[PDB]
Paper text:
Later, we did manage to generate crystals of DUF1-RIDCBD (residues, 1959–2374) in the absence of CaM, and determined the structure at a resolution of 3.38 Å. DUF1 within the DUF1-RIDCBD structure comprises the N-terminal domain (DUF1ND, residues 1959–2227), formed by a bundle of eight α helices (α1–α8), three 310 helices (310h1–310h3), and four short β strands (β1–β4), as well as a small lid domain (DUF1Lid, residues 2228–2264) formed by an α helix (α9), a 310 helix (310h4), and two short β strands (β5 and β6). RIDCBD composes three helices (α10−α12) and a mixed parallel and anti-parallel beta sheet (β7−β12). Of note, the two effectors are connected by α10, which forms part of the RIDCBD. Upon interaction with CaM, DUF1-RIDCBD undergoes a marked conformational change. Collectively, these data suggest that hijacking host CaM triggers marked rearrangement of the domains within DUF1-RIDCBD.
Residue numbers in the entry: 1968 to 1989, 2007 to 2371
Amino acid sequence: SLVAARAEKVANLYRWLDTDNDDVSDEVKQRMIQSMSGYIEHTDNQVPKDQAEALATLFVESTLDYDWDKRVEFLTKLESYGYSFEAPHAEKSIVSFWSGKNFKQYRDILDNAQTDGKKVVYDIDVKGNAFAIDLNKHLMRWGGLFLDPDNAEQNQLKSSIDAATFSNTGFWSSVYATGAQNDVYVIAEGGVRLGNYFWNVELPALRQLQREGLVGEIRLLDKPVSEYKDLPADQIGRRLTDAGVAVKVRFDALSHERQAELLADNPDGYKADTLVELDVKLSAIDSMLRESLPFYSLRTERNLLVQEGEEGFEVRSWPGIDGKSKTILLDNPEDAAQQKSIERFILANFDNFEQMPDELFLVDNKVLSHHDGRTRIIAQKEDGAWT
């Protein structure tokens, strides 16, 4: 179970970043689920004839519910079938946030480009990863086939199968990339744009992952394939760490005084639809990341996992021995200064998880605690006077 450990780490980020902007029928679901059962049960693979309808219920449940526990479940349940999403050392080449025509072409370019004697590992070259994506795509196939765009909340189901399955792929690419840690080559096709999933959720994951040492030396391929062909390795990919992120906006959505400037040079080369590339500072991405993630230091230092709870928060052990739930509650759950105290406090104090209270609590510069009975252990005074 080498996938549960890392996969747990990455799903954590996606929970935080995705969740910032993210009824269903059961009759329709069980048809979905059942073709789900049918794909695997009656296709050639290590799908138990018993637990093959147990995967097309977990898979579809995990994806569309956006249960991140059922996502690691089905990652590691696939690891319980001889599957593997750890790459064979070498150098990884994740391209999976997008899909464009010229994806094969980048590989041909890349392998000859990396003249070592060794070729570049692919995320869809992996044993288990490659199963999962095929399962994803069947939902996708199921997606645009048994749902009609002009019969009400049936297009709403499709738009949600596309939005889950995209969450899935980007998740798997990150956990794959977390494996080996040998530097990645994300290949964005049209060019990283802004306002989409990849940008708000997926890109922060990679750099937030990378910072934590998990992955390293990410290079982004946005310029057309022609641009790369054969030159020194440095002209291959825009390194994340150099400068900022080379995104593409449209003239339309650009400034009013910056359209004028743009038409001073090359005065009728720009139209409404025309796409203009402008570097996003890499300083800005980092900063929204360390504010997109509560108890940001607890994650790094004390090998804990914090996540939003029904009313408070939920700290757990990083390698999940068990699905226990030492919580952390606050009088203002939304005050950052309160949070910072509780973090600073349980940081300067507890060294590990199992050394934690059932449930901690911060009320008006006072600290509660659980054990077996509420024990108030701090002081609103300049230095916290324990007990």
